[PDB]
């Protein structure tokens, strides 16, 4: 219950401080630009804190979205 595919798993040797690694960063947002919760990233209390700061920076550079558009309804 309340568990599918975890994101820390699908990847490997990444730098959580790299705010340019779009191809890696973007795995951590939902279909909308929204930053995924811990229960889906699979990051630890800390890793998540560092990634959120990283993603935020990468949004200002215009590499990651801030918000996107749901595509079913």
Partner 1 sequence: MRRYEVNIVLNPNLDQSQLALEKEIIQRALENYGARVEKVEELGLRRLAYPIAKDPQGYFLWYQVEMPEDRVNDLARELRIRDNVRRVMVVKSQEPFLANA
Partner 2 sequence: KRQVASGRAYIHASYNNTIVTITDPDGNPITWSSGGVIGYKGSRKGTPYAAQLAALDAAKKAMAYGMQSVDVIVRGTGAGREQAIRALQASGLQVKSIVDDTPVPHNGCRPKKKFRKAS
Residues that bind partner 2 (CB under 8 A): 66-67, 69-73
**In whole angstroms, how close is the CB of 13 to RNA at the nearest point?**
20
Residue 64 near residue 58 (C-beta atoms within 8 A): yes
Q: Is 64 exposed, middle or buried (0-12, 13-18, 19+ CB in 10 A)?
A: buried
Tell me: does residue 14 bind partner 1 (CB under 8 A): yes
Nearer to partner 2, 16 or 58 (CB): 58
Nearer to partner 2, 5 or 70 (CB): 70
Distance from C-alpha of 7 to C-alpha of 70, rounded to nearest angstrom: 20
**In whole angstroms, how close is the CB of 51 to RNA at the nearest point?**
7
């Amino acid at each position: 219950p309340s568990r599918k595919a975890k994101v820390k798993a699908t990847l490997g040797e990444f730098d959580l401080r790299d705010y340019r690694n779009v191809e890696v960063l973007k795995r951590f947002l939902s279909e909308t630009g929204k930053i995924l919760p811990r229960r889906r990233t699979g990051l630890s209390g800390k890793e998540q804190r560092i990634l959120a700061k990283t993603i935020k920076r990468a949004r200002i550079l215009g590499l990651l979205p801030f918000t996107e558009k749901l595509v079913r309804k």
